[PDB]
Amino acid sequence: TGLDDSTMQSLKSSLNLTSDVDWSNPNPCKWQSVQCDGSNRVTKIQLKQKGIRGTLPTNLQSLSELVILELFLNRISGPIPDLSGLSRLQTLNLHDNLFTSVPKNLFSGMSSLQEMYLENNPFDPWVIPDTVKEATSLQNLTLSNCSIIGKIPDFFGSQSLPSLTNLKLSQNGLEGELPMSFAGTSIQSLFLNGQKLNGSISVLGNMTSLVEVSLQGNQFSGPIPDLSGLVSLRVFNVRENQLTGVVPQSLVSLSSLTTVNLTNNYLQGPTPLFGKSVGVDIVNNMNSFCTNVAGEACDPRVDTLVSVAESFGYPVKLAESWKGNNPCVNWVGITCSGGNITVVNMRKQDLSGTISPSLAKLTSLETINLADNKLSGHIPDELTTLSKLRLLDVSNNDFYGIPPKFRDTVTLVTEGNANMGKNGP
Ligand SMILES: *[C@@H]1O[C@H](CO)[C@@H](O[C@@H]2O[C@H](CO)[C@@H](O)[C@H](O)[C@H]2NC(C)=O)[C@H](O)[C@H]1NC(C)=O
Ligand SMILES: *[C@@H]1O[C@H](CO)[C@@H](O[C@@H]2O[C@H](CO)[C@@H](O)[C@H](O)[C@H]2NC(C)=O)[C@H](O)[C@H]1NC(C)=O
Ligand SMILES: *[C@@H]1O[C@H](CO)[C@@H](O)[C@H](O)[C@H]1NC(C)=O
Ligand SMILES: *[C@@H]1O[C@H](CO)[C@@H](O)[C@H](O)[C@H]1NC(C)=O
């Protein structure tokens, strides 16, 4: 009476059905919580929260017309079998079982899949396979707490997964950087909290459909990008990272914003002042803001030095040290003669970037040593206005252009800059 009958017997044998599930009929299309279409092919199997033990039969993918498979909150163990024959499957919900592995070709063949929830299964550790690019209808993917390792694959772009909306990969063991193909996507919910992701979060600024993002508890560094395109952003949680730099005004000014968690980073400049409808999680002293008063301006020397750090790319080493509103109190590389900043010394600090023209606003400076780094660009002419400057040593970088003329009394060391004096087109 049906092409799926024999595979359904395999399923009935491999599951220890609880007792209020009646699968006794000779016709599996009449089984409880099983649905068939007009041609007697199985289209839905929905055994929700029954605590059922057993396994999945390895011929499950023979149910080629299966559309809905919901078995979450049971105690089903063993491997998840090959699912590539389930080309009409729209929903796969297996969360909170006892499955111990996923097929290595997961997503292959699954051209109708809209949503997949596997979270909280004790899987053997696995990398998200590149066959995820075959699940071109995917909208919801929750693989949180699934023992995933490796990197986020670069297959979440729009010409692969144009419908992807809710990507939840919380509490795995992912590492590495955010994929570039996140740029231009229409992901609306991104949960990557609680693992080992690192690098820059600038790609967020090209994710203009984002409504909710949590990067909480990773190793992201660098500044928060320009977010002025994220006109629907409501929840922004980047708690417990290594973010540095000034909180951009484009984030503080988003009218859609509802909730912001910045606690436990190395953010610099003034504590930001969000709108008063915003729930704000910024606990005193758990960043590197100049004061703990939201909206309070910094000391102008602090503003100047943060601009200097900006052109170094906001290194974590400076942000961890440059705390409070007085640069004369134990800031690394900063020496003062009673209130006046007199020395900026960052020799051999692996610095990349340029020298900010703002450095010339520290008008009491007597020595600048930036030797033995990886800086480039021009030496700013504004430095020649430093009337008390006696030594500018930029040895062993990659500066170019015309070296400015300092007064007779300034010692300028530019040796080791191969392209110094080169100023052609
Ligand atoms: C994809 O995930 C979203 C959750 O972000 C689902 O939308 C929610 O569904 C629940 C049902 O459990 C409703 O109570 C919520 O009101 C929905 N929230 C919305 C619509 O913003 C959605 O159903 C999932 N599936 C698909 C196919 O999109
Ligand atoms: C992110 O910050 C928000 C805002 O401070 C936190 O939301 C608060 O959570 C507790 C729970 O009762 C209460 O202080 C308030 O009810 C919430 N305020 C709101 C919703 O505006 C939220 O807990 C933080 N998230 C994390 C993961 O730490
Ligand atoms: C994560 O999954 C494991 C099973 O591997 C489970 O014991 C644990 O409760 C899950 N954690 C959460 C927060 O659900
Ligand atoms: C980020 O993590 C990867 C993988 O562990 C590592 O190879 C890379 O050097 C890290 N990058 C940064 C900037 O920390």
**Experimental determination technique:** X-ray
The residues lining ligand 4, judged by C-beta closer than 6 Å to any ligand atom, are: 175-176, 198-199
Domain that holds residue 6: 1-298
Q: Cα of 282 to ligand 2 centre, how many Å? A: 11
Which bound ligand lies closest to the C-alpha atom of 138?
1
- Out of 298, 331, 349, pick the residue that ends a domain: 298
Q: Are 304 and 285 in the same domain? A: no
| Cα gap 288→269, rounded to integer Å | 7
| Cα gap 209→273, rounded to integer Å | 24
Residues shown for the chain: 425
Q: Other C-beta atoms within 10 Å of 137: how many?
A: 16
| Cα gap 28→9, rounded to integer Å | 8
Does ligand 1 have an atom closer than 6 angstroms to the CB of 114?
yes
Closest C-alpha to 284, from 324, 326, 328:
324
- DSSP 3-state of 279: strand
Q: Cα of 207 to ligand 4 centre, how many Å? A: 23
| Cα gap 376→314, rounded to integer Å | 16
Q: Are 307 and 198 in the same domain? A: no
- Out of 298, 323, 355, pick the residue that ends a domain: 298
Give the chain's radius of gyration (CA, Å).
29
Residue with the smallest CA separation from ligand 2 atom 2 is 281
Q: Are 280 and 398 in the same domain? A: no
| Residue 214 CB-density burial (10 A; 0-12 exposed, 13-18 middle, 19+ buried) | buried
Q: Cα of 259 to ligand 2 centre, how many Å? A: 8
Dihedral sign for Cα 145, 148, 150, 151, please.
negative
Q: Are 2 and 121 in the same domain? A: yes
The residues lining ligand 3, judged by C-beta closer than 6 Å to any ligand atom, are: 120, 122, 145
**Where on the phi/psi map is residue 188: left (φ > 0), alpha (ψ -120 to 50), or beta?**
alpha
* Number of folded domains that form the chain: 2
**Where on the phi/psi map is residue 338: left (φ > 0), alpha (ψ -120 to 50), or beta?**
left
Dihedral sign for Cα 31, 90, 204, 275, please.
negative
Does ligand 2 have an atom closer than 6 angstroms to the CB of 275?
no
100: which residues sit within 8 A by CB, 6+ positions away?
A: 77, 78, 79, 121, 122, 123, 124
Residue type, 257: L
Listed in sequence order, the DSSP H helices in 105-254 are: 249-252
Q: Cα of 73 to ligand 3 centre, how many Å? A: 12
- Out of 262, 281, 298, pick the residue that ends a domain: 298
Does ligand 2 have an atom closer than 6 angstroms to the CB of 398?
no
